[model samples]
Target chain A: GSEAQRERRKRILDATMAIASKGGYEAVQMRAVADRADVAVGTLYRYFPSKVHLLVSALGREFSRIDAKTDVAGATPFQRLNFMVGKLNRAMQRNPLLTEAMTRAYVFADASAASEVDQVEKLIDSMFARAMANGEPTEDQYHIARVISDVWLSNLLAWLTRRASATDVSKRLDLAVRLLIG
Target chain B: GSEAQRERRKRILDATMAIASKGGYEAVQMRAVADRADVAVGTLYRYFPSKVHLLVSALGREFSRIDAKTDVAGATPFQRLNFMVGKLNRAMQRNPLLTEAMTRAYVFADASAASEVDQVEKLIDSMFARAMANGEPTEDQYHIARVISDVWLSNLLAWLTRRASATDVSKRLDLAVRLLIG
Candidate 1:
């Protein structure tokens, strides 16, 4: 890819993230994003076909940054996972509105946005995988990682939708680590 | 409540299920649901408020009927859970289109439809709880049930969105039950 194209995409995403951080999913209208990014609406659509695609991509960027800054510090894999859970949970709660927007986008995404959504999933899976194994994980460890990832995403959705409290999300993740990894 | 109200709600939900079964989520337009149910669009709105409420209600009814017809016959708790998991998986697969529509509604529902969505969650939780215990479950059992429910719904979402295979759904649930219950 050309450097110009990459710069244009980054600017668009940066504007989208700022808008979402302030007001959330409903705040990220394509026209508004275009205005904020100083790109034409047509070009914005060229970069992100839909709001779900845009927000999910933005969330992937968020997780990538978090993964770089985050470190797991525990003697056992289970403790490391538990430590990561609390860290991740606190990060999401820090900007509850952004969490709501990005998670709603992620949860509501269909097959139309599968590639973008899968990238976000892999980012999350890789983070949890690293916490579980020093090197590579076995098939069983991968399975466990998948289940933990499922529970994590589902609980986040619950918190976003208000069906489950933030504390409840933490407790469920703790129980998952205990039951599956401990 | 009047018998007439009950009959009307039944007609609305039945029509919704028929449309969703035939073509999945996007097929059950408000106008189409009204036409199929032989009710005014205004009346349908008064009854359901939104398509998410309508589809989630239809899904709850489907699960209720399945619940009444289902029985757990395994000698042990894990065996019972495994058997029930297989049974429930087959029920969802029996009409993948319906599963797609209803599950998407359930997953995408926001706080507006929390009451209807919670009813569906309770129906599912009760079914799994019965499989694990003959009577009332303890708090610990309920936690396990919640984890299993989270995994089940997440896996179904994965399958419906083409992120995972139907067989993968089954295998993941098998592992969840084995890890949590066995």
Candidate 2:
């Protein structure tokens, strides 16, 4: 992609993130996003196939930021995973509405947003792998990381849907890390 | 519900399942389901609210049947969980299109279908609890079952979305069962 296209995409993602930060998933209107980004509504549509796609794209970018700053500081594999998942949970806890928008879009994404959702999954799996084995996870560690990440996202959605408390999220992750890593 | 209402709901669910079995998620259109069930479309909407709701309701009933039939004939908790989860996976494996329709709806469900999805979750959790302790799981066992079920559903979705294989599904579930239950 050209620099111009990349810049425009960034503007679109930033605009979507801003709206989601303000009011969450329902508040994001494509026309409003286009206007905010100084592009045509059709342009936004071309860029992102739907609202779910748009928000998931924004989520991938947000996760990329988190990935860049991840520092799993601990003595053992289990302890490192605790810090890593704790940081991940805190990121969501810090941004309630935005987390709702992004995570809801992610779980709600179907075959239409497969590619975009795949990017998000890859980012998360790689982040977990890094924490699992200090950036050099073997096949077993990678698979364990996938299962742990799977639990993380599912429990996060459970929290977002009010089935579990915020503390439950941390505890569940702790349980997974203990069982899988220890 | 009265007997008549219950019968009506069963007919609606059976019709939806029939359609989904034939052609997976996209093929279970509401109009088609109503026509097959011989109910008014508006009646179907009142009963289900949306396609996702309809499929999820059908999934709940389907799971109830599985729950009743679950026998978990094994000597230990880990072995029973292995058998239970394997049975769950094979049920999905045997019905590809229907599994796609139901699991997709179960995962894609949002706040609108919270109560309905919660019912499904409860059924699965109780089934797991029964398997974990042969009808008498402790509170700790219940929490372990929830985490296991979480991994099960999330990995099931990964298989449905083509990110994982049928073997991978069983392998991942085995990994979770071994780590958590053992």
TM-score of each: 0.94, 0.91
At residue A154, candidate 2 shows an lDDT of 86
User: Per-residue alpha-carbon lDDT of model 1 for B1-182, expressed as tens digits?
Assistant: 57987888999999998888899988989999999888999999999999999999898888989988864588887887777778888789888888899999998888889888888888787778887885677676777777888899888888878888988888899999888864
Residue B109 miss distance in model 1 (angstroms): 1.2
What C-alpha lDDT, on a 0 to 100 scale, does residue A180 get in candidate 2?
A: 76
lDDT value, residue A128 of candidate 2: 83
Error of 2 at B133 (Å): 2.2
After superposition on all C-alphas, the RMSD of every candidate to the true structure, in Å, is 1.9, 2.3
* Model 2, span A85-131: residue lDDT tens: 88888888787778888888887667778788889998898888888
Q: How many angstroms is residue A74 displaced in model 1 relative to the true structure, after the best TM-score fit?
A: 0.3
Candidate closest to the true structure, highest TM-score: 1
Positional deviation of B22 in candidate 2, in angstroms?
Answer: 2.6
- The pairs that clash in candidate 1 are none
Clashing pairs in 2: none
